Amino acid sequence: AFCNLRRCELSCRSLGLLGKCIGEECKCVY
CB 19 within 8 A of CB 5: yes
* Domain spans in the chain, listed from the N-terminal domain onward: 1-30
Note whether 17 and 11 are within 8 A (CB).
no
Cα distance between residue 25 and residue 13, in whole Å: 16
Under 8 Å between Cβ of 23 and 5: no
Q: Which residue, 3, 6, 4, is CA-closest to 25?
A: 3
Technique of determination: NMR
Per the CB < 8 A criterion, the answer to whether 1 and 22 are in contact is no
